[PDB]
Design a protein around this ligand. Structure first.
Ligand SMILES: CC1(N)CCN(c2cnc(-c3cccc(Cl)c3Cl)c(N)n2)CC1
Length: 477
């Protein structure tokens, strides 16, 4: 994941490839994203677009993450051979750039644990760097240790030994080969210092700091961590399952996927169980998946569905109508759905459905369909009010039903908009019950969700929207 450079211009990108690279060499960067590839001694740039639903390469295919886009094309003309590595530490969890000695010690004391480390721009020595580690309150059993990093001729060192190309090289080297103190203190770089974990009550202050862009820096630092969540999706690739996918490359992880037990390969659905109240993050239905969608709802005993998109957007199908018309009755394979009544609110439409297995009478249960419909075609809503009110209603309908299964959430690919609502709900559920006095970490919760379904929360727009949604809920609490 060293191939992504987040702070360079197309001119800098052209030099790098033509001078410090060869034919086949590549790199990605924001300009939307740009894929700069080297072909026959020349740089060829490519557009990568993200609407908030998926990653789109012009002429290429639709992907859940930037890492899988690069991975798919490093085996499948424009050739992707040698990634050109970035030496910039901006997108690194441990880097805190312009930071003071006491400001660093303050954070390592307040939030630090054993092996909690961070790198900063040297206060005293000009142009150099500082590695601060906490090995282990007021008992003196734990201590802060300052290791000077000398910057000389575009290379980094800790006063001796090897000279590294980037701070990233140095950090990853002393993480594997820890520095031993003169009296034997092992300077373990166990994990970087947590800074994103903030109290629920101090959200207005944190947003104010992130608005200074702070949200962009924090968002790409989380995108850097996506290569750590590249878990197997073997089932989605199986011949008989390729048609059951909206997008052949946006597949559910094998470990979290929903396995259909109803009964060749009738067990597949492009869906995942999200366990932080549980959820099912799925895509919009296809003609050949409608019956499977109802087989899932039945099996997992789901009583609430959250539709985050319209049936048709910008002239194309975002989710096929899988529910019968008002007052009508329909059979979807072995399932029978009755649209009891539709009630329209301003931001949504609620559909009271009655799902049951064909042949069995007591198998009937009410499935409340919440269809959100004021989400813009491109981007995120201006105000989080409508979304929050919707989710508040969804929670209380879910809470009212005894032994209810997971809340089914779905948009187009079921990763972007689906992920935004699920993350907003998980965070809002904490503040609801565990009050305003609890710790809220937005990128940790996203990463936890992303471990369960690829690409959950697609854009910086949605990332910021999650903070603005959380802030509002507290401000009105
Ligand atoms: C200036 C800086 N280098 C960029 C922003 N920044 C951070 C830090 N940590 C996360 C984080 C937190 C929990 C889980 C995961 Cl996976 C991640 Cl990545 C984050 N998103 N941004 C602070 C340092």
């Amino acid at each position: 994941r060293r191939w992504f450079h987040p702070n360079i211009t197309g001119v800098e990108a052209e030099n790098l490839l033509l001078t410090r690279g060869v034919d086949g060499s590549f790199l990605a960067r924001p300009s939307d994203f740009t894929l700069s590839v080297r072909r026959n001694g020349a740089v060829t740039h490519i557009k990568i677009q993200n609407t908030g639903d998926y990653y789109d390469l012009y002429g290429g295919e639709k992907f859940a993450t930037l890492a899988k886009l690069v991975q798919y094309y490093m085996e499948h003309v424009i050739e992707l051979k040698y990634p050109l590595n970035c030496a910039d530490p901006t997108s690194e969890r441990w880097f805190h750039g312009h930071l003071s000695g006491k400001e660093a010690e303050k954070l390592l004391t307040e939030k630090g644990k054993h092996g909690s480390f961070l790198v900063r721009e040297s206060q005293s020595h000009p142009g150099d760097f500082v590695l601060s580690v906490r090995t282990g309150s007021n008992d003196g059993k734990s201590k802060v240790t300052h290791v000077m990093i000398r910057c000389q001729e575009l290379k980094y060192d800790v006063g001796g030994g090897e000279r590294f190309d980037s701070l990233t090289d140095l950090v990853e080297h002393y993480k594997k080969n820890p520095m031993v103190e003169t009296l034997g203190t092992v300077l373990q770089l166990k994990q970087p210092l947590n800074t994103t974990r903030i109290n629920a009550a101090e959200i207005e202050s944190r947003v104010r700091e992130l608005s200074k862009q702070g949200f962009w820096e924090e968002f790409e630092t989380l995108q850097q961590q996506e290569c750590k969540l590249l878990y197997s999706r073997k089932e989605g690739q199986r011949q008989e399952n390729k048609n059951k996918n909206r997008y052949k490359n946006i597949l559910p992880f094998d470990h979290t996927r929903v396995v259909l037990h109803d009964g060749p390969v009738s067990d597949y659905i492009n869906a995942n169980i999200i366990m932080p109240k549980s959820y099912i993050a799925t895509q919009g239905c296809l003609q050949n998946t409608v019956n499977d969608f109802w087989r899932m709802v039945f099996q997992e005993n789901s009583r609430v569905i959250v539709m985050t998109t319209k049936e048709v957007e910008r002239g194309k199908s975002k989710c096929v109508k899988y529910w019968p018309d008002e007052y009508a009755l329909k059979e979807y394979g072995v399932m029978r759905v009755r649209n009891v009544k539709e009630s329209a609110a301003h931001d949504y439409t609620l559909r009271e459905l009655k799902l049951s297995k064909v042949g069995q009478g007591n198998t009937e249960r009410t499935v409340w369909q919440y269809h959100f419909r004021t989400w813009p075609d491109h981007g995120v809503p201006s105000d989080p009010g409508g979304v929050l009110d919707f989710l508040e209603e969804v929670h209380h309908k879910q809470e009212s039903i005894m032994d209810a299964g997971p809340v089914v959430v779905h948009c187009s690919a079921g990763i972007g908009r689906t992920g935004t609502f699920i993350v907003i709900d998980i965070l809002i559920d904490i503040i609801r019950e565990k009050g305003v006095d609890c710790d809220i970490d937005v990128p940790k919760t996203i990463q936890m969700v992303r471990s369960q379904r690829s690409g959950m929360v697609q854009t910086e727009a949605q990332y910021r929207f999650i903070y603005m949604a959380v802030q509002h809920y507290i401000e009105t609490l």
